[PDB]
């Protein structure tokens, strides 16, 4: 599923991400935009043998288990396949645990490179929430 910008903003708000641990809703929508372009099925194989999964491109070396990644730790205690659903529930649950570490949203490279420091609120403006 490819979310519309405002569609995802509303979904993420319903999923409790607005200001979760200090991160405004705009941060999450912007992260999804540059990480997966709002595509819940997006995957990206990495050089280290891990793969990034879903709307928030959650990594198989640290966060989810895809059974094919060396040194996997499965910090989110969830199979990566669950992060490839049109239902963002599992991705949000894991994203919350990820951001609950001192590194915060810096875990998301695209967010760090294209969102951090910008007017992230613009990503939820002009939307019926």
């Amino acid at each position, epitope marked *: 599923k490819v979310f519309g910008r405002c569609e995802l903003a509303a979904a993420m*708000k319903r999923h*409790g991400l607005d200001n979760y641990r200090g991160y405004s809703l705009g941060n999450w929508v912007c992260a999804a935009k540059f990480e997966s372009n709002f595509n819940t099925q997006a995957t990206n194989r990495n050089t280290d043998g891990s793969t990034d999964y879903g709307i928030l491109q959650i990594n198989s070396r640290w966060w989810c288990n895809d059974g094919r990644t060396p040194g996997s730790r499965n910090l989110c205690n969830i199979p990566c396949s669950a992060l490839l659903s049109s239902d963002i529930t599992a991705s949000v649950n894991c994203a919350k645990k990820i951001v609950s570490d001192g590194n915060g949203m810096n875990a998301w490279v695209a967010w760090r490179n294209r969102c951090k420091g910008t007017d992230v609120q613009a990503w939820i403006r002009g939307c019926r929430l």
Partner: antibody
Amino acid sequence: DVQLQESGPSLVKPSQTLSLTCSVTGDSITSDYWSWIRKFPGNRLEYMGYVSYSGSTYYNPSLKSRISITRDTSKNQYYLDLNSVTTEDTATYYCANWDGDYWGQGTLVTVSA
Amino acid sequence: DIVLTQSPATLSVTPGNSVSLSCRASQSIGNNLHWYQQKSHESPRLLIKYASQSISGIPSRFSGSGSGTDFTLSINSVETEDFGMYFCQQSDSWPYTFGGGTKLEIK
């Protein structure tokens, strides 16, 4: 499967440092975030703090910096150190993972002169 | 910090009947409210996470509802094994905080 178990003294003196150990069996401590929660004599629960994968810690402000949570990957254990305790620190201490799916059995610690 | 207020403080019910427990937050916390059950001489047990998400291994008679500041834990047809304490806990902001608890007992 995962198992958690608290260990340490049950009787401590006021002003001393209370130290508890949580032994994790079934998986590496590097595979989760680890927490400490305690229950006061009157059904009052307090989330003391947790340590995440990067080593960053989060402590309850109520503990006024008397708390320290550390880990030992080689022994697959993590710890709780609470300095300068008072009778207010008498409670049942539990270790559990951040998700709250795994909990230890809890251990009563009484602070008394 | 975020204060969670639970009501009633105590609830007496006859097995077979249904009950609903309330937990209200001092400020909006989205869906970041979890429910725990705790019995004498035992560690807390997670029943519902993120307001309404089910937990594997928990009886289906337990359900959660709510968002923002008002949440509820419902037990459809209470069983004797359900008597004990129930606590809500929020994870929206650090420090995580617990409600004062609701005691469910047989009447």
